[PDB]
Amino acid sequence: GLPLRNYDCNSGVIWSISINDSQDKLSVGCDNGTVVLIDISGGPGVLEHDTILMRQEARVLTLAWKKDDFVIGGCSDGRIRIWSAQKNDENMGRLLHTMKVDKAKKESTLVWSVIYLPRTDQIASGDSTGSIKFWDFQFATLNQSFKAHDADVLCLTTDTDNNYVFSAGVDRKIFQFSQNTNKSQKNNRWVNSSNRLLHGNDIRAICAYQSKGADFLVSGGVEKTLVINSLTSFSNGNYRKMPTVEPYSKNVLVNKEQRLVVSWSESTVKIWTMGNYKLVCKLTLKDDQNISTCSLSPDGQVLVVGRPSTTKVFHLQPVGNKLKVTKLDNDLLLRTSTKLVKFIDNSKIVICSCEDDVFIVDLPQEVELLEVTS
Amino acid sequence: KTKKRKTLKNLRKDSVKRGKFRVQLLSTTQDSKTLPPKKESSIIRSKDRWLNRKALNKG
């Protein structure tokens, strides 16, 4: 759960990332209009600079790939651009065509999302005007335009056979565009089949997955919750709204003795006491890393705060219906990563490091662990 | 009150001006490796301002 490798793009800040079909190159869109190709075929943790495509003045907001040959990018000047990325070709790194969307009169226009459709050889793009446009890739022209949304179209996604294109955005709606019918396939015409309102706020991220046993259209956004649908039965199929907070890792603990609740969120720990509830103490930590886990001794005097980087133990003394905080120094814990920490007694603890090296500390006695077959 | 905040700001500074030269502190290597780099405020703010622009009348 740590950063294996940090690689700098050699360009402006990143806005969009996308991988090609063969999964050996990353395309990285930049604020200064550049699109950088990074090679990852070397191996895990290996990222090498491959090439810089032709430059331009508009911010690249999104990227999509056609196999490994062409890089399609949406820009902040209201234009869709096709770069050639194929090697062994004189046109490598050049801007083949430029397409322009309808531009809002009293506002700037942005192409938030672009996706490539292998079956029909079309590009589907969403812009800030609320339009979904289907472009013919070979000739770089508009085949169809749908004024569907009332606001920005922030994401697009397609099914496996490209019989469905799903859009979503600020207006909280999910529009299904269908080309399943045989006459539609012959004529290559998309249709605004249906729409649904499932989210309470914006829809920023959407994805689709299909398999012989699975059919998911998962979406999420500012509401901070997932919404799951069926791609094939989107119009009429049931949907599930996942819980906002599903506490697999607990962020709050309770001490039966002295009646204390302790909650830790974003490097800050709050302690309350109940007879009616009073905040006895708040603990603020300098480190940027969020607290992974907090364990309190049965007596409640000793509080251990664990992070992947360091583990700090603070002693609490109740004074004047308030807790006095002191940081006991233990160098071994400070250099120790703490995935999980528990108390044996008021004195001894067990810590499971990020490398799964379990050991006991008195306030290290390592414990053997059975080897897991690969 | 505010001086305590300003004192906190003074501790949270990685450079100081020694005349025409500015000495700057270098962060620990683990700090960079352990955690990804910070977001650039102007860039993220531009995205959020647009999505919350007045014309949408999100109200």
Binding site: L279, V280, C281, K282, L283, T284, L285, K286, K322, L323, V325, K327 | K4, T7, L8, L11, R12
Partner: peptide, 14 residues
């Protein structure tokens, strides 16, 4: 709540 507050870095400094 500043009556009950504790700051590590301020305590570290003094």
């Amino acid at each position: 709540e500043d009556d009950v507050e504790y700051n590590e870095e301020l305590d570290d400094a003094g």
